């Protein structure tokens, strides 16, 4: 044993990473999904404030990542993604985090060109009647405090389960001593009812609520509300037949209700295009379901099924009378619906266990996607505009698939693997509705922006020895009709556009067990992108970074140190980027050092602590948003990362 603090997660199967998100993590995560991804090589995060980052996998942002929770899809509503999908996930309340890199699965939905991320809670198992609880408290610099509870009781026939958290922090300071407008509050509460009549059968109803707020250094407005509401139903029957091994069915309902203003966590900037109190409410309603069957016989295992998904987006805004001074809050007006999306798909995955050391896996899916523009007018400022595609529909049929070959050697515990994958993605809400202009000669983005089609070779290896566990994965790929934002400056209007891209990169890591008490590990992540249409680099691409860890674990306690070293990024595309951010300047390299320890006091209680960024280094990341002028940020000066921070955490388990 010996407890420890997670500083990196290795890749354990080909293309696949699996971690328990309840373990303490050494750059301490701000209780959102993006922060639990940056201990996994290949992930980078766009900082908005102190929480709610936007994840970026192998340089690929946004909906190119398929982020699921218990199989279902949570989508946000902000026109510029202040509430990215991960800003509604609290990883600590889940039991398992899985990443599958590359377009190398078809089981979990459409258009996951960059990868799939699966936060899961696993069903309770009870034999005798009994109960279990595991909780945690964290406390740290800048008023950071986190409560987490996960209790359950039941017997052989069924169970009731509860998971909650509350978490907050004030503004953090950067290395220079400057207070950064960060600071955020988040709470979640979720219940699950489970019924297990016999041991083949399981039915489970889940429901949950969550809310939060966040100040955003890198935005003209702040998130004063992040309301979530969630229901799901799941059926899993095992051993139906001699070949039929599993049948799973699930329905999910996720509702997001975001508010966005410039007066509840800030005062309106008198010197900006926005001196008046302004609020804007937006919501997102996702309904979806999946039905899959797993056949198993001889040397094969086939998984077939279908899925479907609908989601709806509405908005409404406030009003300020300048003639007098009256403010009419946004909830006094009806919701204007503006978009509805539809997807249905059928998919299958075949696996061939070609004896001992040889595995071939192939999969396919066909998707019918479609969208309707419900905007009756457009916004053009307080005065409105005709929307030329009002009530227009458009649709498409998009096939996807992959083959992958896995080979074990006889000599060493080494697996090699190589895989080819193709993935087509329908444009999402932000790609179709958020740009102010479409491609050249279009009426708007909705009318013209084409799907995105990714073809990519993935390859790598695993070495799972005794003293040394190493891994590596590379990727080479082309992207046709990459959806690309370009920015002009009155001031900041975007144009969505399709271009052709080449992409390549990879991750590699190793963790060597020096003695019984000494462990070191290392990792490296590189992404690269070219815009072939305009012959230049792709924008918003994270630079090369390495992580160096060293751990001493005696008995019952451990101490760790971690170095993070990031190269500069000189490959940039000025005024290009996505719906959230844009490149402007080349970034500086930097180094950050941190310390941690853990101590198991009993089989039920364990302690851990750390200091992040010991030397109070004043630094920023290449992908961080530009800090807002109203907070005293000069042009294109991005949001600084936090300076030295201290945290301690206690973990209960009964």
Taking the least distance from each CB to Ag ion, the nearer of 260 and 538 is 260
Taking the least distance from each CB to Ag ion, the nearer of 76 and 529 is 76
Q: Are the beta carbons of 213 and 82 closer than 8 angstroms?
A: no
DSSP element (H, E) containing 520 = strand 518-531
360 is a site residue for Ag ion (CB under 5 A): no
Nearest partner of 394 among 356, 359, 427, judged by Cα: 427
Pairing mode of beta strands 279-297, 336-353: unpaired
**Shortest distance in whole angstroms from residue 437 CB to Ag ion:** 20
**Shortest distance in whole angstroms from residue 318 CB to Ag ion:** 8
Per CB under 5 A, contacts with Ag ion among 48-67 are none
Which residues lie closer than 8 Å to 645 by C-beta, 6 or more apart? 28, 140, 141, 142, 144, 172, 611, 612, 613
Taking the least distance from each CB to Ag ion, the nearer of 256 and 470 is 256
CA dist 40 and 98 (Å) reads 11
**Shortest distance in whole angstroms from residue 59 CB to Ag ion:** 24
Taking the least distance from each CB to Ag ion, the nearer of 226 and 526 is 226
**Shortest distance in whole angstroms from residue 621 CB to Ag ion:** 21
629 is a site residue for Ag ion (CB under 5 A): no
Taking the least distance from each CB to Ag ion, the nearer of 260 and 573 is 260
CA dist 416 and 408 (Å) reads 6
User: Nearest 5°: phi and psi at 86?
Assistant: -75, -15
Per CB under 5 A, contacts with Ag ion among 473-532 are none
**Shortest distance in whole angstroms from residue 422 CB to Ag ion:** 35
CA dist 361 and 428 (Å) reads 29
**Shortest distance in whole angstroms from residue 493 CB to Ag ion:** 15
Taking the least distance from each CB to Ag ion, the nearer of 91 and 218 is 218
CA dist 114 and 97 (Å) reads 17
**Shortest distance in whole angstroms from residue 82 CB to Ag ion:** 4
Taking the least distance from each CB to Ag ion, the nearer of 275 and 439 is 275
Q: Are the beta carbons of 563 and 646 closer than 8 angstroms?
A: no
Stretch that binds Ag ion, among 81-89, 417-425, 457-465, 549-557 (CB under 5 A): 81-89
Taking the least distance from each CB to Ag ion, the nearer of 430 and 526 is 430
Helix (H, G, I), strand (E, B) or coil at 446: helix
Q: Which of 151, 276, 306, 544 binds Ag ion (CB under 5 A)?
A: 276
CA dist 133 and 619 (Å) reads 40
Stretch that binds Ag ion, among 150-158, 277-285, 593-601, 643-651 (CB under 5 A): 277-285
278 is a site residue for Ag ion (CB under 5 A): yes
**Shortest distance in whole angstroms from residue 218 CB to Ag ion:** 11
**Shortest distance in whole angstroms from residue 473 CB to Ag ion:** 35
CA dist 571 and 586 (Å) reads 7
How many residues touch Ag ion under the rule CB under 5 A: the total is: 6
Per CB under 5 A, contacts with Ag ion among 239-268 are 260
**Shortest distance in whole angstroms from residue 257 CB to Ag ion:** 14
> Which residues lie across from 345 on neighbouring strands?
307, 367
**Cα radius of gyration (the chain):** 24
CA dist 343 and 286 (Å) reads 11
Taking the least distance from each CB to Ag ion, the nearer of 81 and 161 is 81
Stretch that binds Ag ion, among 79-87, 191-199, 229-237, 428-436 (CB under 5 A): 79-87
Taking the least distance from each CB to Ag ion, the nearer of 537 and 629 is 629
CA dist 130 and 152 (Å) reads 9
CA dist 389 and 339 (Å) reads 11
**Shortest distance in whole angstroms from residue 325 CB to Ag ion:** 14
Helix (H, G, I), strand (E, B) or coil at 445: helix
CA dist 620 and 636 (Å) reads 12
Q: Which of 153, 191, 203, 274 binds Ag ion (CB under 5 A)?
A: 274
Nearest partner of 258 among 281, 237, 240, judged by Cα: 281
Per CB under 5 A, contacts with Ag ion among 111-150 are none
180 is a site residue for Ag ion (CB under 5 A): no
Taking the least distance from each CB to Ag ion, the nearer of 260 and 265 is 260
339 is a site residue for Ag ion (CB under 5 A): no
Count of CB atoms within 10 A of residue 569's CB? Answer: 22
**Shortest distance in whole angstroms from residue 220 CB to Ag ion:** 6
Stretch that binds Ag ion, among 3-11, 80-88, 231-239, 599-607 (CB under 5 A): 80-88
Taking the least distance from each CB to Ag ion, the nearer of 177 and 270 is 270
Helix (H, G, I), strand (E, B) or coil at 432: helix
What six digits make up the tokens of 362?
A: 């192939």
Taking the least distance from each CB to Ag ion, the nearer of 319 and 394 is 319
Q: CA separation (Å) from 472 to 197, 214, 270, 414?
A: 44, 37, 52, 11
Stretch that binds Ag ion, among 73-81, 435-443, 494-502, 583-591 (CB under 5 A): 73-81
Taking the least distance from each CB to Ag ion, the nearer of 276 and 565 is 276
82 is a site residue for Ag ion (CB under 5 A): yes
Nearest partner of 533 among 634, 413, 650, 450, judged by Cα: 450
Distance of CA 405 to the CA centre of its chain: 28
78 is a site residue for Ag ion (CB under 5 A): yes
Pairing mode of beta strands 60-61, 65-69: unpaired
**Shortest distance in whole angstroms from residue 459 CB to Ag ion:** 40
**Shortest distance in whole angstroms from residue 153 CB to Ag ion:** 42
Residue ranges in contact with Ag ion by CB under 5 A: 78, 82, 260, 274, 276, 278
């Amino acid at each position: 044993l010996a407890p420890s603090v997670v500083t990196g997660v290795a890749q354990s199967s080909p293309l696949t990473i699996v971690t328990n998100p309840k373990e303490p993590r050494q750059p301490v995560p701000a209780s959102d999904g993006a922060d639990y991804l940056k201990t996994i090589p290949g992930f980078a995060v766009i900082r908005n404030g102190g929480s709610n980052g936007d994840p970026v996998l192998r340089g690929m942002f946004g909906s190119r990542l398929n982020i699921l929770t218990n199989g279902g899809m949570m989508l946000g509503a902000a026109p510029n993604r202040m509430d990215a999908p991960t800003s509604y996930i609290s990883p600590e309340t889940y039991d398992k985090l899985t990443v599958i890199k590359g377009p190398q699965t078809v089981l979990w939905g459409p258009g996951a060109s960059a990868g799939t991320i699966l936060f899961e809670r696993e069903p309770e198992r009870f034999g005798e009647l009994g109960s279990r609880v595991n909780a945690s408290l964290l406390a740290g610099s800048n008023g950071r405090f986190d409560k987490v509870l996960d209790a359950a009781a039941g017997n052989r026939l069924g169970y009731l389960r509860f998971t909650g958290n509350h978490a907050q922090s004030d503004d953090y300071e950067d290395g220079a001593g400057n207070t950064v407008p960060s600071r955020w509050k988040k709470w979640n509460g979720d219940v699950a009812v489970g019924w297990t009549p016999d041991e083949d059968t399981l039915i489970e109803l889940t429901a949950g609520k969550g809310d939060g707020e966040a100040r955003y250094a890198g935005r003209g407005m702040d998130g004063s509300q992040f309301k979530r509401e969630s229901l799901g139903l799941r059926f899993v029957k095992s051993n139906v037949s001699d070949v039929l091994e599993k049948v799973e069915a699930q329905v999910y309902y996720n509702y997001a209700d975001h508010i966005m203003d410039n007066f509840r966590l800030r005062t309106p900037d008198p010197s900006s295009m926005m001196p008046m109190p302004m609020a804007s409410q937006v919501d997102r309603r996702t309904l979806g379901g999946r039905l899959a069957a797993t056949w198993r016989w001889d040397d094969f295992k086939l998984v077939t099924g279908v899925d479907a998904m609908r989601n709806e987006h509405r908005a409404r805004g406030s009003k300020y009378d300048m003639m007098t001074d009256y403010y009419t809050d946004a909830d006094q007006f009806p919701w204007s619906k503006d978009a509805v999306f539809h997807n249905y798909g059928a998919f299958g995955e075949l696996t061939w266990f070609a004896a001992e050391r040889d595995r071939l896996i192939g999969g396919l899916r066909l998707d019918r996607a479609s969208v309707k523009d419900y905007r009756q007018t457009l916004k053009s400022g307080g005065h409105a505009m005709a929307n030329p595609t009002a009530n227009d529909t458009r649709a498409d049929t998009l096939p996807s698939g992959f083959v992958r070959y896995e080979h074990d050697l006889a000599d060493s515990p080494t697996t090699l693997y190589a895989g080819l994958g193709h993935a087509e993605r329908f444009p999402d809400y932000w790609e179709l509705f958020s740009p102010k202009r479409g491609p050249n000669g279009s009426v708007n983005a909705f009318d013209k922006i084409k799907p995105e089609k990714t073809t990519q070779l993935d390859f790598g290896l695993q070495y799972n020895g005794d003293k040394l566990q190493a891994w590596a994965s590379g990727y080479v790929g082309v992207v046709q009709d990459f959806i690309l934002f370009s920015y002009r400056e009155m001031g900041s209007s975007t144009q969505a556009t399709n271009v052709d891209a080449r992409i390549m990169g990879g991750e590699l890591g190793a963790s060597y067990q020096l003695t019984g008490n000494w462990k070191t590990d290392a990792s490296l992540a590189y992404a690269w992108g070219k815009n072939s249409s305009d012959d230049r680099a792709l924008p918003q691409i994270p630079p090369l970074e390495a992580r160096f860890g060293l751990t001493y674990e005696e008995g019952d306690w451990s101490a760790g140190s971690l170095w993070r070293v990031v190269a500069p990024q000189n490959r940039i595309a000025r005024d290009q980027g996505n719906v959230v951010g844009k490149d402007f300047d080349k970034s500086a390299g930097f180094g950050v050092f941190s310390l941690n320890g853990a101590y198991r006091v009993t089989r039920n209680v364990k302690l851990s602590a750390g200091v992040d960024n010991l030397f109070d280094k004043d630094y920023t990341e290449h992908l961080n948003k530009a800090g807002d002028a109203g907070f005293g940020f000069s042009a294109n000066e991005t949001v600084p990362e936090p300076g030295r921070t201290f945290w301690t955490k206690v973990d209960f388990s009964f």
